Design a binder for this molecule. Structure first.
Ligand SMILES: COc1cc(C(=O)N[C@H]2CC[N@H+](C)CC2)ccc1Nc1ncc(C(F)(F)F)c(Oc2cccc3c2C(=O)CC3)n1
Length: 261
């Protein structure tokens, strides 16, 4: 069962905000397995059942997934104040982590993060789940060698990350998530810099249609940037599949690891 007794949760500092309320870090003291660090999503308005159902549906959404690179649901407290207890990724948000470690993280760690995210996305595609919000801001750092997709509720227009068909006609498929993943890979190799900085959202569409693309990040291997550009094919059917990106990122990772030993 997923119902958690409130006395077992100690609410810690605020780590972020979501549509329904503040997100906190905290501690969960399970009956048989002591001090576990957890993330706690709060909900200011779920004294109203209309808000409660939408909030708790976000926990049900994470309940169906079980992958090493997707945050897991620990449980829920369904009475007011309503809370969702999630796994805590102690090193926080990927963008800040990459900015802070811009000159200390090796290229193999950056490729490892892209590869780990491709395994989570290939897994979600096998479950017929279209994410729609693939971006570095929605990736968390569990440890130096482990990144995970954050909560899907906290992950929710991001025009600068979207595929042309998603912007033009609101079409959302695994092929549009591949475009977004290409942008997310670019953000990782750029050390947490956002795409199209200083450009208006309305002019992103025009630049993409003129053949312009986000440039090769400094010190990025040409084979890896070439993979990002395949994600940015205008035609969705010409983009690679997540299983192909997963195989190619593994080849690039092993090639980089072989250069060290
Ligand atoms: C220690 O763990 C964390 C620390 C911080 C942090 O330093 N934040 C600072 C605090 C001060 N202000 C001024 C600057 C930012 C962020 C996230 C953490 N870890 C963590 N672990 C698990 C979860 C989850 F998913 F299970 F609930 C989680 O959720 C989020 C929390 C924030 C944003 C997102 C998420 C998403 O899921 C997508 C986007 N965050």
């Amino acid at each position: 069962d997923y119902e958690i007794q409130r006395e077992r949760i100690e609410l810690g500092r605020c780590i972020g905000e979501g549509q329904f309320g503040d997100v906190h870090q905290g501690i969960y003291m399970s009956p048989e397995n002591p001090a576990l660090a957890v993330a706690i999503k709060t909900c200011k308005n779920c004294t109203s059942d209309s808000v409660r159902e939408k909030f708790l549906q976000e926990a049900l959404t994470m309940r169906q997934f079980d992958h090493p690179h997707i945050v897991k649901l620990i449980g829920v407290i369904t009475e007011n104040p309503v809370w969702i207890i999630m796994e805590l990724c102690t090193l926080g948000e990927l963008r800040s982590f990459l900015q802070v470690r811009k000159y200390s993280l090796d290229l193999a760690s950056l490729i490892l993060y892209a590869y780990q995210l491709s395994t989570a996305l290939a897994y979600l595609e096998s479950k017929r789940f279209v994410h729609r919000d693939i971006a570095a801001r929605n990736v968390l750092v569990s440890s130096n060698d482990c990144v995970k997709l954050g909560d899907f509720g906290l992950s929710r227009l991001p025009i600068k990350w979207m595929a042309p068909e998603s912007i033009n006609f609101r079409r959302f498929t695994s092929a549009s998530d591949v475009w977004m993943f290409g942008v997310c890979m670019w953000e990782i190799l750029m050390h947490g810099v956002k795409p199209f900085q200083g450009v208006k959202n309305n002019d992103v569409i025009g630049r993409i249609e003129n053949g312009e693309r986000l440039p090769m990040p400094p010190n990025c291997p040409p084979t890896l940037y070439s993979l990002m550009t395949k994600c940015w094919a205008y035609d969705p059917s010409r983009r690679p599949r997540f299983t192909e990106l997963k195989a190619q990122l593994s080849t690039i990772l092993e090639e980089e690891k072989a250069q060290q030993e």
